């Protein structure tokens, strides 16, 4: 059977697919046409249907997995379109994680003789993250940080070594946010979560601006000025609040200038998109900072697809975590984005 | 001079006024007409201009303060209307706190010979809170909690004794949120803050629903169903997420169902108002819970005018803090709402 792992989230399905590249002449004869058909379809297309995408830049080439050499592919599509995926599949051992492994269990079993094995979404996240960092990103670091994040003329992406990754705070920003404290390969806990996540960004943006996609919302946000919507410390104090070290530029009240009708009438959609992004991102950073301090952990890695093609939020997290922690915490990022759960699911295949 | 304390916040001005009730016949002769005019104006009206309000139900009667007996009055008006207040005053030693004590310092000095003394907004909050609880609310408890907050048929407001109030986590929900850890009458720290506060509720509500007042936003929220806008755990899992004890009714993604155009087209303004209230309130409770755990404090008192005439948010905080802390934290509330800073400022008068 083809080797897949699937993470069915509240918004996106992520699929990891292992393409063998050590197929012998005898193995090629022995493989059935449908199996060859799937491999050809997945590797000869980068768009699947109208909403599936293969992230070619993330491919791991010539990986040794389960004693075979192959390429590891990364594919995503909206959970809303899973019925189309299952219908394609009806006309294999599937290790699946995320909430949708449970929600859509009965739907996967409409595919005859298909064997579904449900795995925990945070177990798979941890296992996939540790695995990808261990094998490297085609010889490059999987993990990076922003050096000198407080200085724009100096701020730059730099590789970061996670050879001894423990302990580690993992902040998974999907539809909602889960925060994990990882103490060893087999010892972690879900410290807490927040419901102000990527779905809040996308949902509020859609209501406030009429944007029709995540990418459109980020484009609007890149053009906006969040201080047109937010009430800053300097708007309340006339300057810094010196006694407690709060700079005048800090946000005192997100969207707090929208209590004035004249300001609501002048604010732009781009301003509102940027205020939504800044509000969500700062809240995630602040919750992460509080969790890191309580867990006595100084490395905080942010994952999940809220941050895909989202350098604005990544740089805001890098700057804010450094600033508000007085340099005691470091924001870390991973090239593989939102795919760790899907990889972790695939890694569960030998247990079945 | 009249005895005032003033807290000029980012949204509301709060004024505490001590009305002497032990005036002798000689003192009545010796008082100048303008002084009598102010006392008469303040005590014979409950609405001042078009936007000032005296909260008569909060009056402390027959209080002994600075060696005199009198009534303590509580008055509020929008900071936007402070220019009208100052103009009335131009045509006294003023202890003032909040950011506006600094922002509008030069404006107060347009009142001739008026002496402004700026005091710290969180110092005044702590001093005012401890003072009002110490003198009682006309013989009743100033502090209350919701007993059996997990059970609607049992949930009821009950008095709570703060005779030995330390340690105490104080969560001040104004335009933005400050969180204080109070260890003694003279030992406290601002643990952190959040910018998702009362101004976020009012500002987002205004954008999403067109409401024109705080009271209108709460009325809309009382009629709405936040689950029409929020994505719940059961929407992602089909039920509970059992492994980490997350109930299916928990919000996974605030506003997360608004990523679907058809759902944006069916949601009501009342639903959006309630989702805004639930999102802000749960985030405040969660940040408070994390701070209480790190500070090793089990009593959390919520103050600030986000909670005035807002039983919905108070009951949500009572329930959520109890539920998510597994009964280890208790939510406490104070009858005096948003007035503690103004009282603390008034208490600074003897130092000048
Ligand atoms: N093409 C996209 N479509 C929709 N959302 C996107 C897209 N790209 C990035 N995002 C963002 O990524 C988020 C989803 O991240 P993801 O890590 O895939 O969550 P999920 O696994 O589907 N949800 P969860 O069940 O909470 O783990 C969205 O909320 C968006 O903010
Ligand atoms: N009549 C009202 N008008 C405006 N806001 C109100 C009113 N009643 C209650 N509120 C709420 O109370 C909040 C303000 O609380 P308050 O404690 O007075 O803050 P503040 O001191 O003005 N701001 P800050 O500078 O951050 O301390 C608003 O953000 C609203 O959510
Ligand atoms: C005194 C009143 C007017 C007031 C209330 C409220 C605030 C907001 C506040 O106190 N803060 C501190 C914590 N903030 C962050 C942000 C990012 C990270 C990361 N990563 N960490 N913390 C956010 C702003 C300021 C002022
Ligand atoms: C696994 C994915 C799908 C997921 C992500 C995110 C969440 C949200 C979450 O994890 N939580 C726990 C903490 N919550 C509160 C709330 C109030 C208080 C008070 N007072 N404290 N905590 C809020 C919801 C659930 C599920
Ligand atoms: Mg996920
Ligand atoms: Mg205030």
Numbering used by the authors:
A (entry chain A), B (entry chain A): 11 to 101, 109 to 369
Which lines from the publication concern this structure?
Pantothenate kinase (PANK, EC 2.7.1.33) is the first and rate-controlling step in the only pathway for coenzyme A (CoA) biosynthesis. The isoform expression level and potent feedback inhibition by acyl-CoAs control the intracellular CoA content. Within the cell, the PANK3 dimer exists in one of two distinct conformations: the inactive conformation stabilized by the binding of acetyl-CoA and the active conformation stabilized by the binding of ATP•Mg2+.
The crystal structure of the PANK3•AMPPNP•Mg2+•PZ-2891 complex reveals that PZ-2891 binds across the dimer interface to simultaneously interact with both PANK3 protomers. The ‘ring of ligands’ linking the two protomers explains the high thermal stability of the complex. The isopropyl moiety packs into a hydrophobic cavity created by V250′, I253′, Y254′, Y258′, and A269′ located on the flexible flap that is disordered in the PANK3•AMPPNP•Mg2+ complex but becomes structured in the PANK3•AMPPNP•Mg2+•PZ-2891 complex. The carbonyl group forms hydrogen bond interactions with R207, which explains the lack of PZ-3067 binding. The piperazine ring acts as a spacer to present the pyridazine ring to the opposite protomer to hydrogen bond with R306′ and engage W341′ by π-π stacking interactions. PZ-2891 interaction with R306′ also allows an inter-protomer hydrogen bond between R306′ and T209 to further stabilize the dimer. Comparison of the PANK3•AMPPNP•Mg2+•PZ-2891 complex to the PANK3•AMPPNP•Mg2+•pantothenate complex shows that pantothenate and PZ-2891 both form hydrogen bonds with R207, and the isopropyl substituent of PZ-2891 docks into the hydrophobic cavity occupied by the dimethyl group of pantothenate. However, pantothenate does not interact with the dimer interface, and the connection between R306′ and T209 in the pantothenate complex is mediated by a water molecule rather than by a direct hydrogen bond. The structural analysis suggests that PZ-2891 first binds to the pantothenate site of the PANK3•ATP•Mg2+ complex followed by closing of the flexible loop, and the engagement and re-organization of the dimer interface. The induced fit mechanism is the most common binding mode observed in high-affinity inhibitors, and with PZ-2891 the two protomers become locked together to create a structure that is distinct from the structures of all the normal catalytic intermediates.
